Amino acid sequence: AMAQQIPPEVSSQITDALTQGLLDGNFLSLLNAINLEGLLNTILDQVTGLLNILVGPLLGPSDAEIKLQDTRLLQLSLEFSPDSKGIDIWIPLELSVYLKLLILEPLTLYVRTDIRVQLRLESDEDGKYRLAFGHCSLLPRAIELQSGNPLSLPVNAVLGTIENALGNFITEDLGAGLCPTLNSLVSNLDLQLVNNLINLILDRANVDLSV
């Protein structure tokens, strides 16, 4: 957002309400319930045929499990969509994922993703303007290693793979389990907030557009 930015006042109440929906609802609970098998399975798929299984004498049993550890949510934000006639709602999350290997040291990963859903501008039955939920992509901004020694075999296969997998799981998996919830909260918040975004977009369009 280099052309125009959102007023902290208006953004503060949409983030309030949007986060409130996260709080009041069960946003983090979705994650906790999210099919983590995909990650686990993905990570196992990648880590095998990569390091110790690919170039490693005496292959071991590829047993493992995956767990969510520390799921939390930060303070939301909004931006104007890149001329797409809408606004980007950024829901930032801070999750921590724990993978459990049989005999290998279990590592913990930290992921900080900033969801980006777009509320477009459209006109409803009364010819009035409303917020049109058009886009809901989760954007994995951060994936940091919580535990794991780099002073060993090439990141123990548990780095690039983790980010590969997590960067997928946010967008693919989380944007699957969390998308309906977001399209609920944004569609359940304040009408004033709705209009505040609308009037904003119309303003950033051209004050009101065709006055």
Rounded distance, CA 11 to CA 4, Å? 13
- Structural domain including 68 reads 1-211
User: How far is residue 38's CA from residue 109's CA, in Å, rounded to a whole number?
Assistant: 16
- Report the half-sphere exposure of 135 (CA within 13 A, side-chain side): 19
- Residue 10 tokens read as 């208006």
CATH number at residue 129: 3.15.10.10
CA atoms within 13 A on the CB side of 169: 29
This entry's atomic model was obtained through: NMR
In the chain the beta strands, taken as DSSP E runs, fall at 64-68, 72-73, 77-80, 86-101, 107-123, 129-137, 140-147
8 A C-beta contact, residue 97 and residue 163: no
- Give the number of domains in the chain: 1
CB 102 within 8 A of CB 63: yes
